[PDB]
Assembly symmetry: C2
Homo-oligomer: 99 residues x 2
């Protein structure tokens, strides 16, 4: 399985960030990547179910999801994803990384 799954130009990345943030320009962005890639939708379901979280995109081909909301909501969603995948699906996990 040797594949480039994404080779993409974001032509207007500032516009793209405001589009993901929506009305709350004080928001944070959460990003998850995982394998097998098709399980991205389960991360998107967990994040998208939180009251102040919006999904920006889900990509089952690259295995990625991006979402936004207030920082506490985004951190809690990421923790919920790590916990579900580890405890319910036997996935190995990384630390919750912050920038």
């Amino acid at each position: 399985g040797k594949q480039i799954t994404l080779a993409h130009v974001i032509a207007a990345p500032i516009e793209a960030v405001y589009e993901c943030l929506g009305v709350d320009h004080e928001g944070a962005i959460g990003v998850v990547s995982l394998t097998p890639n098709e399980t991205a939708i389960i991360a998107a379901d967990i994040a998208g179910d939180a009251a102040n979280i919006d999904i920006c995109f889900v990509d089952r081909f690259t295995g990625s999801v991006m979402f936004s909301g207030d920082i506490q909501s985004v951190e809690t969603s990421l923790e919920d994803i790590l916990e579900y995948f580890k405890n319910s699906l036997g996935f190995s996990t990384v630390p919750l990384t912050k920038s």
Copy 2:
């Protein structure tokens, strides 16, 4: 191969995007994702060696790279990565995409 390879919160994504663009706020961002993930460093080498391209990050564990520069330099670097992985390493490749 069941792994969460990235679970990341960006607290200030507008500032994050301007730091990645650097001096040229009218710049584009290129993003590559691939498998096996460890080869992401070769994509970052190819992009990074181009005179008008700055690497924003490379993550060998997730298989992703992000880099910035003028739109034509970013597109040329993506084409170069796609040609190298296909022709030198035998990788399957997605089309070069843009949003």
